[PDB]
């Protein structure tokens, strides 16, 4: 027959190959296709959906709704940092489990901006201004509002519009970053402060909850397919 020479890699089995193969069920009549709502084409369609972020992930709240609560109080609290965390969409414990981060863990590389939406859940009478800042890698975490204010910040004024978006721009040296972020591929930090304060009328709560949402932008993208480190077993299930 046609003189052929087998090349290295023959008869092997690579889980990520892509060849043709004989059907064990010839002429099988596939069930008619039905147009079902909510079809997914690209996983990024999911990572672009806001999901509540457990910013208050302290040991005592790892199993309560308080994990999502970001309290804010009335009275002087100048110089006090409401909250803070690193920018590790897939490594940071705060994002690690959100829809976004949950997907990044199936990949090793990521790139793009992130939308951190904050919603004030206080009463309709409570007012206030918060300073949402983002500081790129390079210096120590902002210890004061002045230091945080020097970086990319957003002054959110609570009002009829409950939510406010703090878009964290992609300011990296390299085009991509590792989901398993190290110091080299550092992304920076995000600190929240009191721009002014939360004033409230008589007969109204003094503590309010502020929910945080995180999602990818239209410039986001993953790249290195890998297995997620959030699932395993010790033996076949039954």
């Amino acid at each position: 027959g046609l003189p052929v020479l087998n090349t290295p890699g023959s008869n092997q089995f690579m889980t990520s190959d892509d060849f043709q193969s004989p059907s064990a069920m010839p002429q099988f009549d596939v069930t008619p296709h039905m147009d079902i709502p909510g079809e997914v084409h690209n996983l990024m369609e999911i990572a672009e959906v806001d999901s509540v972020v457990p910013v208050n992930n302290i040991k005592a709240n790892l199993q309560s709704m308080d994990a999502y609560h970001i309290e804010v109080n009335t009275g002087n609290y100048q110089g006090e940092k409401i909250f803070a965390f690193q920018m590790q969409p897939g490594l940071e414990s705060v994002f690690k489990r959100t829809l976004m981060g949950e997907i990044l863990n199936y990949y090793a590389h990521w790139s793009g901006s992130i939308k951190l939406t904050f919603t004030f859940c206080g009463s309709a009478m409570a007012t206030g201004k918060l300073l949402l800042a983002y500081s790129p890698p390079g210096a120590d975490v902002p210890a004061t509002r002045k230091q945080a204010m020097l970086g990319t910040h957003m002054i959110w004024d609570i009002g009829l519009q409950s939510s406010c978006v703090l878009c964290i721009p992609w300011i990296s040296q390299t085009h991509y970053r590792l989901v398993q972020q190290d110091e080299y591929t550092s992304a920076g930090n995000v600190t929240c402060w009191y721009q002014t304060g939360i004033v409230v009328p008589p007969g109204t709560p003094n503590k309010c909850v502020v929910l945080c949402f995180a999602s990818a932008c239209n410039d986001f993208s993953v790249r290195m397919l890998r297995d997620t480190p959030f699932i395993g077993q010790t033996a076949l299930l039954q």
Binding site: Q20, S23, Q27, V49
Partner: peptide, 25 residues
């Protein structure tokens, strides 16, 4: 070139780049 009679024998469609996040976003 497809050698088999069943479409199920063909290789994956790794080049279908459609998108519509609107459904969820």
């Amino acid at each position: 070139i497809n050698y088999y009679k069943d479409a199920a024998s063909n290789s994956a469609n790794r080049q279908d780049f459609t998108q519509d996040p609107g459904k969820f976003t």
